[PDB]
């Protein structure tokens, strides 16, 4: 069959992954100063949702817990899945920076996904103004609207429509393309999904849906102050996921052993190169496993130098009684001050509830 929140385990065990994604997010927000490196920060990351997962249902030995996303922080037009190598260069923040931090955890398979976004140095008492505020602003308000929208009974197509006029008010644009996936257990790619303002090609090729009793989403909103279109860089991709419907006879032994212990290890949860020893061997095991379409790449887009990408995920339960978001950051709406503000009266409306 199939465990959903219709029972009362199920949530508990999607709350405390919640609760969990919620503690660690905070602490790397406080942790997050000009000089600070953003490899050490991803790797801090990683660690407490290990550390916190590992005080919970002790007596189950065969229980899957720990990273559902590897811990990534894209600053300003980074867009995401910036997750750095202790090979690569990675990034040092600075002041006024504008960084969005991504984790993700899981209990038993039940994901519990929260993304945030702050700036650097941002003097008390103070307010940040600027493009930086207009997308913040933005993204904020998007979120908002899903919350509000994402509902038994609507499509996600009048989520997409909310997030275009959202966005427009404040010159912002969310990144075409971009998905919001349902949640199952062990599954973080849900099958339906919300689309952010997609292209003409892309509106035709997908599948509007309708939102369910007792479904879960991982609501990820990306809002740029550019075109809002995201471009591969030299950027190495460092996030992979095993495609569990994929199969493939792998010549190489290398290959074989590296993919054993993906298989073994994360299943089929996204996972970070940096979670391996020998990273030389990792970087050649992936080579065959990702030609053969075996793993999923979760590559870092770029928007064009200059402009911001402020984003906001989060993970609600579909439950009778209303929507109930398990994940979210330390939000302070009265910290960004923009010149612009929702000008359609029924959006404006919908947003004060």
């Known amino acids: 069959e199939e465990q959903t929140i219709a029972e009362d385990l199920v949530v508990t065990?999607?709350?405390?992954?919640?609760?969990?994604?919620?503690?660690?997010?905070?602490?790397?927000?406080?942790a997050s100063s000009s000089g600070v490196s953003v490899l050490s920060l991803c790797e801090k990351g990683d660690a407490m949702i290990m550390e916190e997962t590992g005080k919970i249902f002790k007596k189950e030995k065969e229980m899957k817990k720990g990273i559902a996303f590897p811990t990534s922080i894209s600053v300003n037009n980074c867009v995401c899945h910036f997750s750095p190598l202790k090979s690569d260069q990675d990034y040092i923040l600075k002041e006024g920076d504008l960084v969005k931090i991504d984790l993700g955890v899981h209990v038993d398979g039940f994901i519990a996904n929260v993304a945030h976004t702050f700036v650097i140095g941002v003097a008390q008492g103070t307010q940040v103004t600027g493009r930086k505020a207009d997308v913040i602003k933005a993204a904020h308000l998007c979120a908002e609207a899903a919350l509000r929208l994402v509902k038994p009974g609507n499509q996600n197509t009048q989520v997409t429509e909310a997030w275009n006029k959202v966005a427009h008010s404040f010159n912002?644009?969310?990144?075409?393309?971009?998905?919001?996936?349902?949640?199952?257990?062990?599954?973080?790619?849900?099958?339906?999904?919300?689309?952010?303002?997609?292209?003409?090609?892309?509106?035709?090729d997908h599948e509007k849906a309708e939102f369910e009793v007792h479904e879960v989403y991982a609501v990820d909103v990306l809002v740029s102050s550019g075109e809002g279109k995201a471009k591969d860089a030299g950027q190495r991709t460092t996030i992979y996921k095993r495609d569990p419907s994929k199969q493939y006879g792998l010549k190489m032994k290398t290959s074989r052993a590296f993919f054993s212990e993906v298989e073994r290890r994360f299943d089929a949860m996204p996972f970070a190169l940096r979670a391996f020893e020998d990273e030389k061997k990792a970087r050649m095991g992936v080579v065959e496993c990702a030609k053969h379409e075996l793993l999923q790449p979760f590559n870092v887009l770029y928007e064009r130098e200059g402009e911001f990408v402020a984003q906001f995920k989060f993970t609600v339960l579909l439950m009778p009684n209303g929507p109930m978001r398990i994940?979210?950051?330390?939000?302070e709406p009265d910290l960004y001050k923009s010149e612009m503000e929702v000008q359609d009266a029924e959006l404006k409306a919908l947003l004060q509830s």
């Not at 065990?13 to 406080?30: F, H, P, Q, T």
């Not at 971009?178 to 099958?191: A, F, N, T, Y």
């Open 327 to 331: 994940t979210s950051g330390p939000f």
């Open 172 to 204: 912002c644009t969310p990144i075409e393309g971009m998905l919001s996936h349902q949640l199952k257990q062990h599954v973080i790619d849900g099958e339906k999904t919300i689309i952010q303002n997609p292209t003409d090609q892309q509106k035709k």
């Open 13 to 30: 065990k999607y709350k405390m992954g919640g609760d969990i994604a919620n503690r660690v997010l905070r602490s790397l927000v406080e």
